[PDB]
Amino acid sequence: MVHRVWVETAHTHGGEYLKADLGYGEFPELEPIAKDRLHIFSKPMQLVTEKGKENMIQRGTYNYQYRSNRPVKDGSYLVTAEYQPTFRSKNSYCEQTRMFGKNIVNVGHESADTAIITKPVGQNLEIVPLDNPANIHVGERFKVRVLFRGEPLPNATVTATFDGFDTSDRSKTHKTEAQAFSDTTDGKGEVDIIPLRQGFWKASVEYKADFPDQSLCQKQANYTTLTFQIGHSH
Amino acid sequence: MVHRVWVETAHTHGGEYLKADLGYGEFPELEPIAKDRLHIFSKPMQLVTEKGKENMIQRGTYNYQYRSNRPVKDGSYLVTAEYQPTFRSKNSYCEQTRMFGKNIVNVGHESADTAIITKPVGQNLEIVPLDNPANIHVGERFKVRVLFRGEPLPNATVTATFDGFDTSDRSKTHKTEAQAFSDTTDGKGEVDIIPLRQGFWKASVEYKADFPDQSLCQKQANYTTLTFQIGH
Ligand SMILES: [Co+2]
Ligand SMILES: [Co+2]
Numbered sequence: 001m002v003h004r005v006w007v008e009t010a011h012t013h014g015g016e017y018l019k020a021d022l023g024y025g026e027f028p029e030l031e032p033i034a035k036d037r038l039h040i041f042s043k044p045m046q047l048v049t050e051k052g053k054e055n056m057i058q059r060g061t062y063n064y065q066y067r068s069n070r071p072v073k074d075g076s077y078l079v080t081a082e083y084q085p086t087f088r089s090k091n092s093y094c095e096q097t098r099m100f101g102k103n104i105v106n107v108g109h110e111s112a113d114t115a116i117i118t119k120p121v122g123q124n125l126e127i128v129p130l131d132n133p134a135n136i137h138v139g140e141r142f143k144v145r146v147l148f149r150g151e152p153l154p155n156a157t158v159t160a161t162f163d164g165f166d167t168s169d170r171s172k173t174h175k176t177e178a179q180a181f182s183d184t185t186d187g188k189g190e191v192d193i194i195p196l197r198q199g200f201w202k203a204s205v206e207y208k209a210d211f212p213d214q215s216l217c218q219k220q221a222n223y224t225t226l227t228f229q230i231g232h233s234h
Numbered sequence: 235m236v237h238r239v240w241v242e243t244a245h246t247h248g249g250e251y252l253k254a255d256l257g258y259g260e261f262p263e264l265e266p267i268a269k270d271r272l273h274i275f276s277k278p279m280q281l282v283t284e285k286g287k288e289n290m291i292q293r294g295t296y297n298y299q300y301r302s303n304r305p306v307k308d309g310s311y312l313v314t315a316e317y318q319p320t321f322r323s324k325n326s327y328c329e330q331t332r333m334f335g336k337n338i339v340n341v342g343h344e345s346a347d348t349a350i351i352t353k354p355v356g357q358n359l360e361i362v363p364l365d366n367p368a369n370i371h372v373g374e375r376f377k378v379r380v381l382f383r384g385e386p387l388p389n390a391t392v393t394a395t396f397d398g399f400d401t402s403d404r405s406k407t408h409k410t411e412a413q414a415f416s417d418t419t420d421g422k423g424e425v426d427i428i429p430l431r432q433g434f435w436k437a438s439v440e441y442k443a444d445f446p447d448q449s450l451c452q453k454q455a456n457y458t459t460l461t462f463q464i465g466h
């Protein structure tokens with residue numbers, strides 16, 4: 001069907017390596033990226049810490065698994081993935097597709113720092129959180145912002161779902177695309193997600209616009225997600 | 235201020251009068267219809283029974299409060315309201331706006347009739363339920379069909395929210411309320427809503443297309459809603 005990009009990190013305590021997974025497909029099913037689509041993920045996923053952006057390495061039984069170079073202390077970090085810009089033809093016209101994913105990882109049951117996670121990373125279409133997902137109970141408001149080319153993106157629809165919401169009769173041709181939240185961004189680009197359950201959540205946004213250089217391509221489509229945790233697994 | 239149209243019903247046991255309300259504004263705050271938009275609601279709300287559609291009586295303190303002419307027996311009915319077609323200029327082109335609202339009313343406890351609540355009443359854009367909400371608990375799929383001009387509508391975004399989900403912004407931004415559900419219809423216009431908390435629920439779908447007679451108006455917009463209850 002349709003393929004979107006997201007990131008998922010396993011529960012990590014202090015002193016360990018950070019195991020992360022790049023999902024290209026239908027959330028939340030992790031699946032290996034096909035050989036004809038290996039070139040669209042040219043660069044490895046990055047990990048954001050107090051020192052900056054670090055390249056992760058690809059190690060595991062499947063090609064979507066990554067681990068950090070060195071173990072990290074307790075804290076709260078981001079892990080980002082990118083679908084490299086590619087060109088396609090539709091009907092006819094050219095269109096450049098790009099996709100982005102960012103996951104908030106809280107290593108340690110006590111850390112909920114906001115210094116690293118709230119700073120934008122430079123994704124063309126980016127969802128920047130303004131709080132820590134661990135500070136939000138069910139029913140509270142999780143305030144985030146939507147940026148496009150650096151500036152805020154007003155009047156942009158942000159939806160959100162979680163693992164376990166849409167599950168009935170799913171297969172290759174059924175969606176499990178039902179969302180547990182939907183709203184629009186204000187003039188400052190901000191919006192508040194309201195989670196009614198606990199688990200692993202993904203908030204999605206998209207933006208189709210005109211390509212800057214019309215002598216090369218005409219349209220542009222960006223699909224961005226942000227993944228986090230509501231509640232506590234351990 | 236968006237000003238969307240929906241409907242609301244009170245706790246009614248079989249035998250007494252059916253008192254309903256027409257909301258024209260931001261859900262769920264009821265507010266009287268201003269004098270400059272009375273003409274858009276020239277036709278009163280209708281109530282459907284086994285006897286068919288019957289008009290209601292706009293009697294009460296405010297001009298949005300309606301009462302049933304005939305006391306109703308126990309069962310399951312629908313109450314409908316219409317924002318009549320108006321023309322506006324946008325940019326420069328013409329757009330015809332029509333809006334609709336429908337409420338499932340279960341009068342009397344243990345009322346789960348589906349004889350008439352699942353029948354299309356004939357709204358240009360319509361949200362026809364395929365189940366009684368009283369039989370739907372928390373976390374259970376509620377299958378609804380979306381009709382446009384009689385035939386189903388595929389790939390239409392249906393959202394749903396409930397009273398108490400969003401508690402902010404009385405008139406600061408006047409933007410749309412936060413939704414607690416969002417999905418799209420399949421090839422037969424069907425979609426399953428998943429209510430995660432008990433309360434007074436309202437679902438919405440909108441459709442913007444061309445106008446049939448291009449020598450009169452160019453565009454057309456329809457905003458249709460469906461209100462019901464999930465426990466208490
Ligand atoms: Co633990
Ligand atoms: Co009672």
